[model samples]
Target: VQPLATQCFQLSNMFNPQTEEEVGWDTEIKDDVIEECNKHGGVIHIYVDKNSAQGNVYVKCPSIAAAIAAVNALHGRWFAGKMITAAYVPLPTYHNLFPDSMTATQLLVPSRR
Candidate 1:
């Protein structure tokens, strides 16, 4: 089950949502990001977790197939007005662990009001 837990994808080079013209903050931007997710497998969970520098997007697909496709679908693609890169990490990292990030335990309210 350990190896199977590595089914997480993180898209680098993304801009975090903090200002008015940001992704998560601005509903219009996410309209495209949601449409932008071209994962082949079913998406169990997904939310673009981004910031000023390297941001975050929580995409939890139960199947390993989706993980493989995440790299293919998002790697080096133009996302959020920039070239975003994708990578799959292990279990612990999936619970929101990275170089520069917060304890993003919030995925409610839909958007900032």
Candidate 2:
């Protein structure tokens, strides 16, 4: 699970919709990032926050090695007039994605009468 988190990177510093010359550019930005990242390795998923003013991009690679390679290949790259930054996400942050899931111990523990 820890290794999986390492495969995920977040790219930020996107144009603020309210201030940008054209609104809703984040969608295109996400598409562009996905296309570029996929060239290096398979991308499991990519998310762009359209509801909020913050232009954040989330990317999940197929594997840790692929993620590391993708990050190295994509970090500090230019996008939407901003230099995109990619960073590994910690395990806890990854777990938060499933708030209701049971821990491994909880699932494996024997029940007592």
Best by lDDT: 2
lDDT of 2 by residue, 13-55 (tens): 6546566665646656666666666667656656666654655
What lDDT tens digits, residue by residue, belong to model 1 across residues 19-81?
337433535444444444433544444655544356656565545675666556666567568
lDDT (C-alpha) at residue 112 in model 2: 24
Best by TM-score: 2
Q: In candidate 2, residue 87 scores what lDDT?
A: 68
**lDDT by candidate, in order shown:** 0.53, 0.61
Cα lDDT of candidate 2 equals: 0.61
Off by over 4 Å in 2: 1-5, 51-54, 79-82, 98-113
- Measured with C-alpha atoms, the lDDT of residue 62 in candidate 1 is 48
Give the TM-score comparing model 1 with the true structure, all chains together: 0.56
